[PDB]
Ligand binder design. Sequence first.
Ligand SMILES: Nc1ncnc2c1ncn2[C@@H]1O[C@H](CSCC[C@H](N)C(=O)O)[C@@H](O)[C@H]1O
Lengths: 232, 6
Amino acid sequence: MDVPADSHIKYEDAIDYWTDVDATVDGVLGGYGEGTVVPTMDVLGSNNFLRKLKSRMLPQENNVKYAVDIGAGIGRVSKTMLHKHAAKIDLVEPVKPFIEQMHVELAELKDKGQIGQIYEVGMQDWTPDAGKYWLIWCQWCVGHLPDAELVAFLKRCIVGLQPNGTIVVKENNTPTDTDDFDETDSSVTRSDAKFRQIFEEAGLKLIASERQRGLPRELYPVRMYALKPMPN
Amino acid sequence: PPKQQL
Ligand SMILES: Nc1ncnc2c1ncn2[C@@H]1O[C@H](CSCC[C@H](N)C(=O)O)[C@@H](O)[C@H]1O
């Protein structure tokens, strides 16, 4: 058998790649920007997913809906989707020109004080404050961590959840039970089976798994996973 | 990001 796909990940190669990508919707969506159906479909599907999960996301212990946008790029998901649902938003993104553009993209939200902290770091080195988040939203980025590191990240995320907080992963899937390494951006595309293994090892239970509909046929499937900590 | 399936 081949060495594991995730053994080829090199963080420095990923950051070198993304640092030279245009700080635009086309850049962060790998060419599938506003001239395509993808941004529109993405927001529709994410909004529908969160709407159907409302009964699973009632805040507890006097909390409000503080979210974090992980691997946020230029802030597209916060600008176009998360701000409707969340009381306040933090963002985690390692790439410097993306952070710089994020300040422009999120200007209107900043005027309302809706942006808390922007953490210029890779998710592997980031820790959420304990108990802070109603929602930890991880979209189109977790392939940059190998499996073990992703388990570790998700374990830190659990401690970062409010009571009844939720983790969402919105990510590509391979069509078979074999993961694919992409040398261009130094990341892996995982199977659904691999994601389920990782979620179990992190101590999470799936409460929803939904396919993002309406995307161009040539793309890998995209899935939305909603996750809760396993009860003690 | 979204990506073309191999
Ligand atoms: N180790 C890492 N931790 C967090 N984000 C990372 C990362 N390595 C790369 N990324 C980021 O992952 C993003 C993938 S593109 C997706 C951007 C955004 N989530 C959106 O949907 O619009 C890029 O912004 C890239 O810089």
